C-alpha cells in the first residue's frame, strides 16, 4: 500500500518502510587508474575500512531492511540520523542535499511488467562522501550493470576519474533506465491508441485510467528528478569537482527531455479519453439515426394503417378503386419521400 505514515516516531529512529526484506548483500568495487578490486560480502565490518581509501570506491548495501548496517555506516561516515531515516524511508521523494562532508541524493528506479500495467518503484539512496560513493537499495539487481562492466573492463573515462564521475555514472545509468521505461510506456500508449481507434469498449476506459495513473505517478517522481539534477548542476558544492560539472548537464538535459516526453504522454492519454468520448457521442448519433429513420418512416405509416382501419360504419373512403391498394401507393410515395429526405440529409 501507499503507507505514507510512520506514525510519529522520533526523527533519529531508523525503521524500514518497504516490503522488500528478503535479500541483503554488500558489493564493493574499489577502482583506481591501474587497480580494480571487487568483493561481495554480507559483513559490513570488512567494508567499513574503505571509508578513508584514497582511491575511489563504490559500496552497495543491497537490502536496507537490515537497519543495523545502515546505522553502522552512518556512524562511521558521519551520516546524519535524518539522512539515515531518509535512507530507510523508501516512500521519500527524490531529493538532493549537500552537507559539509557529503552529498546525499535519493532517487527512484521504476520497473514495468509486460502482460500487466503496474509500475513498481525501488528507492535507491546514494551518498557521495570522501571520494567514496555509498549506495542503498532494497532489491538485488539494479540498473547500474553497465557502470559495473565499464569499471570492470577499463571502458570509458570513469577509471581515470574520481568519485564525482562515479556519482555521474550512477545517475546516468538510472536516467537511461528511465528512457527505457518511457519507451515501454510509449509502446503501451501505441497499443491503447490503436485499441481505442479500432475497437472501443467498456474496458478500454479502465485501461486508459490505469495508464493515466501510471503517468501521474511518473510525473510525481520525475519532477523531483529535474529539481535534483538542476541543484546538482546549478551551484557547485566543494565535494563535486568542476571537471565533472558539465557531465551533469547531460543527465540534467536528459531529465528535461524525460519530463517533456512524460508531459506529452499525459496529453496523449487525455486525447485518448477524449477520442473515446467522441466515439460514444458519434456512436450515439448513429444509433438515434436508425431510431429516427424507422420512426419517421413507420410511425406516420402505421398512422394511415390506423386512420384508414377504424371501425367506422359506411365510411366514405370505402369503395374507390378497391379500397385496399389505393392507399398503398400513398404509403409507398410517403415512405420514398422520407427515404429521399434522409438520403439528402445523409442519415
Residues within window 15-44 making contact with Mg ion, judged by CB under 5 A = none
Among Mg ion, a second copy, none, residue 256 binds (CB under 5-8 Å by kind): a second copy
**Closest separation in Å from C-beta 68 to a second copy:** 19
User: Is 250 near Mg ion (CB under 5 A)?
Assistant: yes
Span 73-132, contacts to Mg ion by CB under 5 A: 86
Name which of 48 and 237 has its Cβ closer to a second copy: 237
Q: Which is nearer to Mg ion, 30 or 255 (CB)?
A: 255
Cα–Cα distance between 8 and 230 in angstroms, integer?
32
Q: Give me the residue label for grid cell 448519433.
A: 285
Q: CB of 1 within 8 A of CB of 123? A: no
Q: Which is nearer to a second copy, 42 or 257 (CB)?
A: 257
Residue 53 or 278: the one with the smaller Cβ distance to a second copy is 278
CB of 155 to a second copy, least distance (A): 5
Residue 143 phi/psi, 5-degree rounding, is: -105, 5
Assess contact for 261 and 269: CB atoms under 8 A: no
Q: Which is nearer to a second copy, 66 or 289 (CB)?
A: 289
The residue range among 10-18, 19-27, 68-76, 337-345 that interacts with Mg ion, by the rule CB under 5 A, is: 10-18
Tell me whether residue 211 or residue 251 sits nearer to Mg ion (CB atom). Answer: 251
Minimum CB distance to a second copy, residue 343 (Å): 14
Q: Is residue 227 close enough to count as binding Mg ion by CB under 5 A?
A: no
For residue 57, the cross-strand partners are 30, 132
Among the listed residues 12, 246, 271, 309, the single contact to Mg ion using CB under 5 A: 309
Q: Which of 11, 12, 325, 332 binds Mg ion (CB under 5 A)?
A: 11
User: CA 13 to CA 88: how far, in whole Å?
Assistant: 10
Rounded least distance, CB 218 to Mg ion, Å: 20
Backbone angles phi, psi at 106, to 5 degrees: -125, 125
Residues present in the chain in total: 347
Burial grade of 90 (CB within 10 A; 0-12, 13-18, 19 or more)? buried
Question: The C-alpha cell of 330 is what?
Answer: 400513398
Minimal distance in Å, beta carbon 111 to a second copy? 15
Q: Cell digits for 190?
A: 501505441
Q: What is the C-alpha separation between 272 and 190, in angstroms, rounded?
A: 10
CB of 338 to Mg ion, least distance (A): 24
Total Cβ atoms within 10 A of residue 165: 21
Total residues at interface with Mg ion (CB under 5 A): 5
Amino acid at each position: 500500500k501507499r503507507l505514507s505514515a510512520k506514525k510519529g516516531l522520533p526523527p533519529g529512529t531508523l525503521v524500514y518502510t518497504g516490503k522488500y526484506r528478503e535479500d541483503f548483500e554488500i558489493e564493493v568495487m574499489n577502482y583506481s587508474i591501474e587497480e580494480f578490486r571487487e568483493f561481495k560480502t554480507t559483513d559490513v565490518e570488512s567494508v567499513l575500512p574503505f571509508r578513508d581509501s584514497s582511491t575511489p570506491t563504490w559500496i552497495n548495501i543491497t537490502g536496507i531492511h537490515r537497519t543495523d548496517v545502515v546505522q553502522r555506516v552512518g556512524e562511521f561516515f558521519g551520516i546524519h540520523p535524518l539522512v539515515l531515516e531518509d535512507i530507510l524511508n523508501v516512500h521519500q521523494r527524490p531529493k538532493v542535499e549537500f552537507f559539509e562532508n557529503y552529498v546525499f541524493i535519493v532517487l527512484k528506479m521504476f520497473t514495468y511488467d509486460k502482460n500487466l500495467h503496474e509500475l513498481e518503484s525501488e528507492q535507491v539512496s546514494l551518498i557521495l562522501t570522501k571520494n567514496c560513493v555509498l549506495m542503498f537499495q532494497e532489491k538485488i539487481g539494479d540498473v547500474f550493470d553497465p557502470v559495473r562492466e565499464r569499471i570492470r573492463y577499463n571502458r570509458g573515462i570513469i577509471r581515470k576519474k574520481r568519485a564525482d564521475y562515479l556519482l555521474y555514472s550512477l545517475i546516468d545509468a538510472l536516467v537511461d533506465d528511465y528512457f527505457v521505461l518511457l519507451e515501454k510506456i510509449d509502446d503501451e500508449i501505441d497499443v491503447l491508441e490503436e485499441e481505442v481507434l479500432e475497437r472501443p469498449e467498456k474496458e478500454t476506459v479502465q485501461r486508459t485510467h490505469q495508464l493515466k495513473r501510471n503517468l501521474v505517478e511518473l510525473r510525481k517522481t520525475i519532477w523531483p528528478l529535474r529539481e535534483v539534477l538542476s541543484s546538482l548542476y546549478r551551484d557547485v558544492p566543494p565535494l563535486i569537482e568542476k571537471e565533472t560539472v558539465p557531465y551533469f548537464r547531460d543527465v540534467y538535459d536528459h531529465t528535461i527531455q524525460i519530463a517533456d516526453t512524460v508531459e506529452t504522454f499525459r496529453d496523449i492519454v487525455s486525447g485518448l479519453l477524449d477520442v473515446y468520448l467522441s466515439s460514444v457521442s458519434n456512436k450515439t448519433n448513429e444509433v438515434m439515426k436508425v431510431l429516427t429513420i424507422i420512426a419517421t418512416i413507420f410511425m406516420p405509416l402505421t398512422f394511415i394503417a390506423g386512420i384508414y382501419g377504424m371501425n367506422f360504419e359506411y365510411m366514405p373512403e370505402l369503395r374507390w378503386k378497391w379500397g385496399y391498394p389505393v392507399v398503398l401507393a400513398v404509403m409507398g410515395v410517403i415512405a420514398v419521400i422520407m427515404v429521399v429526405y434522409f438520403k439528402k440529409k445523409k442519415w
